[PDB]
Write a protein that binds this ligand. Sequence first.
Ligand code: HEM
Ligand code: HEM
Ligand SMILES: N[C@@H](CCCNO)C(=O)O
Lengths: 201, 206
Amino acid sequence: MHVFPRYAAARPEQAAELVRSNPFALVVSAVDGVPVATHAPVILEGDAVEGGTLLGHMARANPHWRSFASSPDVLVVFSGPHGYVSPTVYATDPAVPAWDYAAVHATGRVELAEDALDVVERTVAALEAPRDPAWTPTPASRERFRALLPGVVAFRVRVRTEQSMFALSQDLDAERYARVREAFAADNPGLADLMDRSLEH
Amino acid sequence: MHVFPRYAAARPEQAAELVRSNPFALVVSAVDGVPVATHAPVILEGDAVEGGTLLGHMARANPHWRSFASSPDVLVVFSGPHGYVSPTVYATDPAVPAWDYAAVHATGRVELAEDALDVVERTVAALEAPRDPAWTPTPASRERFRALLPGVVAFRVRVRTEQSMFALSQDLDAERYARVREAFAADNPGLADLMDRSLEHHHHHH
Ligand code: HEM
Ligand code: HEM
Ligand SMILES: N[C@@H](CCCNO)C(=O)O
């Protein structure tokens, strides 16, 4: 990722916030020169992405995790709200379309996790916390977790470098910014909320 | 990507439909074992993803394209609607959470595209086609395009392999499936609509 200076994070908490808010991530490694990716829930341990630790799991039947045994670098991509910006919204001549989006790319050394039950149970706790009411695993569900464990592989990524993009129209002037924000308010309220939180800095 | 048989596409038309519907893709290369990714609009040339050609562009200022000569194996990830499935929705004991989603992973060789103007103009046409009204570039806009072109690097991907995941709760029983779809209908109608279209020709036991 090439972070355009105008679209850089305003505060390091912004990157960590996007990661925590969007745990369904893309985990990428290189296998014989070919990138291979798995969609998986990934949670953050620590206050910052850079220097933090990511924890995730995937299927044992998914051969991707075999590339982690040698502890290569892996890239984990967290994607926030996003949306196409049509020149119809800009309502100007000379116009060029855009795509507004936010994302955090974390790269670091992967390590297979022996504590696979701990990872999945911490993932439940993290993903249920924003819900009201939250689901708490019962003894019967935790027994089911143990029964499922042979089929899961858990992993940790120690983040060496983080790049975060917040391309949220902050370069526009007040007039068009309002047009873009109002257009997203309708059917992309997540993007509109992220625009509001992005100017909160 | 490992495509679990239970979540496989019923027809290759499903993969191409997802790609066309979700053009803001992730373009990934690997350089000396380190993956690098760029978010970019990518369009499909042809009726099928496998064997088809993808066209996209990124910033010339983005050093990612410099790797295309020495590392031409590239993955393009197209992501459709998705959403967390809480066991609260199931309303059953023994339960395990899930994340429902659909995605297409296209892998192949990348090459620089010589006609960058054609790529960006076809990208406009594709992204405006589902809109009403659709925006057609004015002469002044097309002049601006030509003025901006030096700052673009356009690329082509000849797709060797396509893998598609449609993890849309098809393994649940009908009762639980209905609960999941109804829960998504409110604030994730795109995901609910995708569940509906995916279950049309979904084949168990195939
Ligand atoms: C907390 C929320 C959870 C989410 C969002 C989630 C999501 C997922 C996803 C997306 C996959 C596919 C990964 C891949 O493509 O390789 C997967 C696989 C798997 N996960 Fe989880 N999971 C969660 C919790 C758990 C728990 C608590 C367990 C208990 C052991 C578990 C065990 C498994 C197993 C056994 C598989 C392999 C499935 C198969 O081979 O068919 N997961 N999970
Ligand atoms: C059709 C909808 C379009 C979308 C969604 C779109 C999106 C994008 C994105 C996301 C980037 C950043 C890529 C990166 O990170 O490297 C980019 C770069 C760029 N695109 Fe497009 N684009 C569109 C159309 C066009 C058109 C018609 C032109 C006319 C030449 C154009 C010219 C450029 C330029 C000059 C850059 C580099 C900007 C810079 O250096 O800051 N784009 N575009
Ligand atoms: N789908 C598997 C395990 C999924 C757990 N992660 O979603 C099952 O239901 O046995």
